[PDB]
Design a protein around this ligand. Structure first.
Ligand SMILES: [Ca+2]
Ligand SMILES: [Ca+2]
Ligand SMILES: [Ca+2]
Ligand SMILES: [Ca+2]
Ligand SMILES: [Ca+2]
Ligand SMILES: [Ca+2]
Lengths: 174, 174, 175, 175, 175, 175
């Protein structure tokens, strides 16, 4: 299982690995099968929305909601599921999903020179942050779930949470 | 301008023409330029939603909101903008957009045998009607606009509104 | 690790099975699982300009009369990637023979797409869609000189019966 | 207006003709020119999961024995959009009958794609590719109960002669 | 009707112009407007495996020093279809010469995508993106034996200046 | 595990080899095998708007002068997914140097696509296509300031000899 075998990053927390589960533009929500590590269909979103970013997890992390720590990587061309990307955290989306702390790192790929000058949350166009928050605010509405979006934190805050999640993993597993 | 030159349908109101502006899966919202009849970008949706149906207008119609009557055609493979489809109305979505009556016909293509037994609103899976209503409920949320979804009418009601819109066009233009 | 051998046939057999997808809807490339390694392998490029009309794969830990894992076709609105696991509800079975071999294939819908919540048996599928699937398997190997015979469609109960047979066959051959 | 009537048959007929594309390679939707309106119109969704193996259209200002514009079928590496004009070199012709009507089709390559610079006649096309095109037309209307008959392929010389005949037929019937 | 002649250069020249798109981002096919009819036409297939990095088109009712309509590149997140009109804000201009011809091209953002609300001048564009556009035009005709010289980028004010020049040139040649 | 170490070089080397695909035709993303992890990893986004003109990968259990697995580049009509195995016939070899290192690449066609049945050597490939591949490799790292040198193409005989040498080098370095 790639979640357990891969390190959290080559230079934590400045550069982490993102293990992508869902490419931008997908309406299918994929997850990793915990037994086998194969990709598994979790569900088809109930609404005609698509993931606005490549979406995945940071290996060897664990979070308050009892899952690996989520990461969103802005890719110009989406990658395939189960692709590793070297990513620089630039911010963090604060949200609760049904009372669980479900925060998500926002990151850019180190190896696309397009994003060389994106280093903090203030470098992202605000319409783009709004569209991401709106997606998570409404994507489970027809399943009757409520999500609360609490805002965006900056790069420093993102990196602190990554360190916290790396420590939580070490506790729970070994 | 195709809006003025084409008849409303070969067998109104059982079979109408749909002039498609937006193929299913588009985030770009297109309209017809009224001067030239060329396709024009109206806007990019502010949220990562895609049109869940091929979306267009019925030629030579006019509606209470001061626009051609809208029609949504369920296509398995989306068509290109400015394509004419022969469509059978099977229902109607009732909604208001900023206080304007903005109802939209739901239809299936006559020439796809997949839909041969779809003749009324009750033949559509309810999750699919929900996803369409949810799209129109939220797609302008970040533009600060409010839309109210009032429910779905059946095929007979759709066909009555089509006749009304065909008459309204004749009044206003000639 | 070979997914075919390592995954259970499903979480609630035969009402819900796992489909391990090999070929997404819309592909002209026909992929298979490499027997030795479990990697995806190109079997062939179809000789005609036809595309797979459904997401196509196998049920893990099954064996059928034709000497292969039992095939399953899953109706997906948006195709998945190869090697994706889908929890699927069987709703019917296509009966066909390919060069003397019984090459029947389960038809299924995904449990986690609410669009298909009411599809529970073969009669819930538009007839034109069943015909398009059957026509595909009737003709897709015509230029390879192969003849296939479509024998018709069986219902959900029959599909479930055959899944149980295939699971038992696997146990006898490998277990 | 109607591009079918407004555009010349080609800049150097019959060596180079215009192909007015109606259906891009890969489409399961079959489009046709209103022929009175001029705008693209959905004729049908193919009943089988087959896709057009070439970019398909008509030569402007032509008329053929079947009572329609002359079908041309251009090999493109990347498909174009409907209503795009391509300068095309005829390299052959598919002889077929559809419902008894002579429904022959020109096969051509784009002048402005150097990939095909050395394709000049029907013998330059891989045989498997000619077979895939013929098989598509043999079977694409099978579920509609129509019968087509594939009679074989003619060479570039024959295709060019037929183009000139179609140009003459248009003049007699309209001009 | 020919869109190039019938549409105004824009609703609020030179702050907002119309871009009539001929080539969507991601295309290897290079399309143009047919001079006589206004239909889309394949100009060529690029000789190298490069794709247009931006949606590419022309400003209606303009004429430039190189004897063609003035070209405009629009940065779109999702590409449009050919012959689509986009209201665009010019933010810069690429200066380049193609075989002795001044072939400068306006860079613009769509007015109706809020993603670009803060892009108002050449300095707002990531440098790597400008380089990728320039590299494309530097090399895309290399195998055709053509040499192009990239002279650099001008700012929004310069782009607007040139748009006004191009509008005047059109009036003098056709009006 | 790591498919690079687990899979044989081919079922009938050097006439038929396995190509383990890392990058599908059309990708601007350059992927590489963790080579220790085994999972697909993004190496870089190409700095220019170029796309891989072929499906690109490596031959398992090979090692080459450049200190990596032997690059193979399979002509597919429909691209495959990363980590797919294709049975491939070598028809030639591209000789090139990258940063001074001998970075030669096998060119191959799939055994199971009848379209390429008559492609057996480098002379069977359209010259424009060989030029497009070479131009891609000549220029794709230009904005990274790297220099590559294209030295030309060898025939099938030469490609096969090099495959055997690479198989031997792997054995010496690992086996
Ligand atoms: Ca979480
Ligand atoms: Ca309306
Ligand atoms: Ca089977
Ligand atoms: Ca015909
Ligand atoms: Ca120019
Ligand atoms: Ca190498």
């Amino acid at each position: 299982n790639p979640f357990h075998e891969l390190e959290p990053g080559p230079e934590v927390p400045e550069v982490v690995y993102a293990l992508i589960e869902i490419p931008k533009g997908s309406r299918n929500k994929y997850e990793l099968d915990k037994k086998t590590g194969l990709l598994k269909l979790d569900r088809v979103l109930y609404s005609p929305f698509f993931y606005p970013v490549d979406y995945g997890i940071i290996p060897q992390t664990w979070y308050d909601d009892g899952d690996p720590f989520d990461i969103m990587v802005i890719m110009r061309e989406p990658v395939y599921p189960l692709t590793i990307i070297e990513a620089r955290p630039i911010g963090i989306m604060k949200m609760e999903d049904s009372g669980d702390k479900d925060w998500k790192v926002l990151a850019v790929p180190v190896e696309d020179p397009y994003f060389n000058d994106w280093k903090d949350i203030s470098d992202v166009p605000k319409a783009f942050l709004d569209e991401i928050a709106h997606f998570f605010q409404r994507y489970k509405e027809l399943q009757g779930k409520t999500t609360k979006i609490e805002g965006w934190g900056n790069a420093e805050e993102a990196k602190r949470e990554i360190l916290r999640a790396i420590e939580m993993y070490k506790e729970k597993f070994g």
